[PDB]
């Protein structure tokens, strides 16, 4: 299947409480493998997955230097955006950055990303062609004009199509036992009487990896969305994921309903029916 590597940076200003908080995490697919926290004691990039711990001191030194450089630039970015938006020094504000790359089942480059948000809304984002920018508003046009005149996108194209792909491949190989595994969901259905009139059917998918999954209800073989509820896919805490979907049905008609489970670890989609 396809894979991705992504880094997520969160920078939060703390007026009167010293330097801004800075947190960086790195993911391969749905597995976190590194973190950095400006408030932690070590002041180093740290491992968060077993397979990355085999990297030697030059790796950790290099990643620590780069993540501190990212932190220094975000410190200034907060002050820069406060000016663009004519905001006071009194309030707390949040800058987010995400970048990384997707590859196909042949592990060749598919898509690259490099984008920013300010206080929860888009600020600027590299477009899919890796040559141009989407400025979310008038303030972000300033950044876009600067980045265009400096050909910033061309240097990022090289990282997203080169280093990012190459090291995603290296991680996928070094972590093959866990990153290349496909844990199919374990499934079951529960039934609860809400009254003497209607019943809730709940279709469960447990201990699956990766997170991507589709649970759908059908009645008489036709897709059914009315009277259904679907929760967000959620982490089990052991590296796997969980999800459920429910439908409320008239009592005596449970046998008309089927839950359908699609996941990359299934050789064929599953169809569950009550009892």
């Amino acid at each position: 299947g396809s894979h991705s590597m992504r880094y997520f940076f969160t920078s939060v200003s703390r007026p009167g409480r010293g330097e801004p908080r800075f947190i960086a995490v790195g993911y391969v697919d749905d597995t976190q493998f590194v973190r950095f926290d400006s408030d932690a004691a070590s002041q180093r990039m740290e491992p968060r997955a077993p397979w990355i711990e085999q990297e030697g001191p030059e790796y950790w030194d290099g990643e620590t230097r780069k993540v501190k450089a990212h932190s220094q630039t975000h410190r200034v970015d907060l002050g820069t955006l406060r000016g663009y938006y004519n905001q006071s020094e009194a309030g707390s504000h949040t800058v987010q950055r995400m970048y990384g790359c997707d590859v196909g089942s042949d592990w060749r480059f598919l898509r690259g990303y490099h984008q920013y948000a300010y206080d929860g809304k888009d600020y600027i984002a590299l477009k899919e062609d890796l040559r141009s920018w989407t400025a979310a508003d008038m303030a972000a046009q300033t950044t876009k004009h600067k980045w265009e005149a400096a050909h910033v996108a061309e240097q990022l194209r090289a990282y997203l199509e080169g280093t990012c792909v190459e090291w995603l491949r290296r991680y996928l190989e070094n972590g093959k036992e866990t990153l290349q595994r496909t844990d199919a969901p374990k499934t079951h259905m529960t039934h609860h009487a809400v009254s003497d009139h209607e019943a809730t059917l709940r279709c469960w998918a447990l201990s699956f990896y990766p997170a991507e999954i589709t649970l759908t209800w059908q009645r008489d073989g036709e897709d059914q969305t009315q009277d259904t509820e679907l929760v967000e896919t959620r982490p089990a805490g052991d590296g796997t994921f969980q999800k459920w979907a429910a439908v409320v049905v008239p009592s005596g008609q449970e046998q008309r309903y089927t839950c359908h489970v699609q996941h990359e670890g299934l050789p064929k989609p599953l169809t569950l029916r009550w009892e």
């Binding site: 780069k66 970015d77 600027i124 990282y159």
Partner: peptide, 9 residues
């Protein structure tokens, strides 16, 4: 691996 590119808003 992180990028080393200098990017400032």
């Amino acid at each position: 691996k992180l990028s080393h590119q200098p990017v400032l808003l």
